Ligand binder design. Structure first.
Ligand code: HEM
Ligand code: 7W1
Length: 289
């Protein structure tokens, strides 16, 4: 099963910079969402969930086909809460109806990372909408109540190794869990991309507690939380070494996250030899906007 990137007809960097800018300006504007967190973190999670359905074994799922727009995937219990991200992107799609759904969802995640002061994430266009019958079944996204071995095995299906997994998990610096979405609660309210997830893991005094949904999570008296799968990164000695590395080197974390996130958003896509190079979009701040 082959998905060949096909550039939206006649479009080039400047077109996609315009879409980036529209997303970024709306991120600035709609600042009240989720107790003033803003839409940045949910857009990152949306880009990951539309990509994280991929299966390397048969090339099903993945960001290419934009299948989150269909009911089966939109209604996946694992995706509860992401409708807010979809709704945010609706007026962007109405203004730029030529962009494919997979390109829009993945670009939303790139734009959010960068606008939240994260690393630059090179991004490639050319995902093409596929029909409703290509929508992956529910159950391909990961459970949070599990251990390091589960996490490691899970991510092999996405062709990610230990360093890639630990780097990607650093996105849990962003946003928060919501009891009604996932059965986990808390995590404060950060909307600036940093390596703080790793600092929090190593430096806080963690207690294993039950939340109001009767699920276990790790809590600190400072008011932070970690999912069982988050905490597994310091329980496993291979993951712990990498956590320590990222806790001690912001730039390395940024560079490794950028690579892993681009890879995640491109899994399953065949780029022709004569496709455009990846685009690196300027932030609003870089443009003086
Ligand atoms: C073992 C892997 C992972 C598990 C089990 C997991 C689980 C979760 C859970 C349960 C939530 C809370 C959802 C809610 O209540 O609203 C969440 C939020 C989030 N996840 Fe993950 N996640 C994983 C990996 C990732 C990855 C790889 C990324 C992106 C690179 C990511 C990005 C985020 C973001 C940004 C949020 C916050 C969303 C918000 O504030 O609305 N997650 N994740
Ligand atoms: C501090 C922390 C830890 N884990 C998280 C998992 C998902 C989303 C946000 C998180 C978060 N802010």
């Amino acid at each position: 099963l082959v998905h060949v990137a096909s550039v939206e007809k006649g479009r080039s960097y400047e077109d996609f910079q315009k879409v980036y800018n529209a997303i970024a300006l709306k991120l600035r504007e709609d600042d009240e969402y989720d107790n003033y967190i803003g839409y940045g973190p949910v857009l990152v999670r949306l880009a990951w969930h539309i990509s994280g359905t991929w299966d390397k074994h048969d090339n099903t799922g993945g960001s290419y086909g934009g299948t989150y727009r269909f009911k089966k995937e939109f209604n996946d219990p694992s995706n509860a809460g992401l409708q807010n991200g979809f709704k945010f992107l609706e007026p962007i799609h109405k203004e730029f109806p030529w962009i494919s759904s997979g390109d829009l969802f993945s670009l939303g995640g790139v734009t959010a990372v960068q606008e939240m002061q994260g690393p630059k994430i090179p991004w490639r266009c050319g995902r093409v909408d596929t029909p409703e019958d290509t929508t992956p079944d529910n159950g391909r996204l990961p459970d949070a109540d599990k251990d390091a071995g589960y996490v490691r095995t899970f991510f092999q299906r996405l062709n990610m190794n230990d360093r890639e997994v630990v780097a990607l998990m650093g996105a849990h610096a962003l946003g928060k869990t919501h009891l009604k979405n996932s059965g986990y609660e808390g995590g404060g309210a950060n909307n600036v991309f940093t390596n703080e997830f790793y600092l929090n893991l190593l430096n806080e005094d963690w207690k294993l507690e039950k939340n109001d949904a009767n699920n276990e999570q790790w809590d600190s008296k400072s008011g932070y939380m970690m999912l069982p799968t988050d905490y597994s990164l310091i329980q496993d000695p291979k993951y712990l070494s990498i956590v320590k590395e990222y806790a001690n080197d912001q730039d390395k974390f940024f560079k490794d996250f950028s690579k892993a996130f681009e890879k995640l958003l491109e899994n399953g896509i065949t780029f022709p030899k004569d496709a455009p190079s990846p685009f690196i979009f300027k932030t609003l701040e870089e443009q003086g906007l």
